[PDB]
Write a protein that binds this ligand. Structure first.
Ligand SMILES: O=c1[nH]c2cc(CNS(O)(O)c3cccnc3)ccc2n1-c1cc(Cl)c(O)cc1O
Length: 208
């Protein structure tokens, strides 16, 4: 059973802006996704201070970067708080309608696409490099779900019966044919060092 949803008009417009605008500094997508993972990890860290049983689904708080040259995918895995099915559907737990507005008002006021994260809609910068994005998530209060979208105004949600994660979120970037540089170890290392060198959780770059 696959459910198909329409993006809210402001999100479809934000996604069209990211896909169609000429902007060479595409590498910021990784900073934005690592920042989202760090926010999810802060959230489970905080919640577990009062209820340590919330870490029954996994005590390790980390981020893994997994390139796969054969599948042409870059996967960002975190063991953060995860998202419920409702959260996924409601713009991946973001304030995307009000954030898209504030980002649009900022762009007209002298901002560039790299400031997207300040408006809480940094997730959608994944479409700077990916033709398709799959989000696998597991929250303690819900089952494991897979969100997916190739943009074009719609997304799907289905239960994920493949590899249970325990808790957290997996962002699978199906890279555009001319964005394969983001599968190279030296390029990922460079971007992590430049934009995410002081994240409060271990970032492990997997090798092939
Ligand atoms: O899976 C989750 N759970 C998350 C939880 C948070 C924080 N959620 S909360 O605290 O409910 C919130 C919502 C809206 C505004 N302020 C705070 C942030 C990112 C999360 N993520 C997450 C989201 C994206 Cl898009 C991602 O790339 C990776 C992630 O781990």
């Amino acid at each position: 059973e696959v459910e198909t949803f329409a993006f809210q008009a402001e999100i479809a417009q934000l996604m069209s802006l990211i896909i169609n605008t000429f902007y060479s500094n595409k590498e910021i997508f990784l900073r934005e996704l690592i920042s989202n993972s760090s926010d999810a990890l802060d959230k489970i860290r905080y919640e577990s201070l009062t209820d340590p049983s919330k870490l029954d689904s996994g005590k390790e708080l980390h981020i893994n970067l997994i390139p796969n040259k054969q599948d042409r995918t870059l996967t960002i895995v975190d063991t953060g708080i995860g998202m419920t099915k409702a959260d996924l559907i409601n713009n991946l737990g973001t304030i995307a309608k009000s954030g898209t507005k504030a980002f649009m008002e900022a762009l007209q006021a002298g901002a560039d696409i790299s400031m997207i994260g300040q408006f809480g809609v940094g997730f959608y910068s994944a479409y700077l490099v990916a033709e398709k994005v799959t989000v696998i998530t597991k929250h303690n209060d819900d089952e494991q779900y897979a969100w997916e979208s190739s943009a074009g105004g719609s997304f799907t949600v289905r239960t994920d019966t493949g590899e249970p994660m325990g808790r957290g979120t997996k962002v699978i970037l199906h890279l555009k044919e001319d964005q394969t540089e983001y599968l190279e170890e030296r390029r990922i290392k460079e971007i992590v060092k430049k934009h995410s060198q002081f994240i409060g959780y271990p970032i492990t770059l997997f090798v092939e």
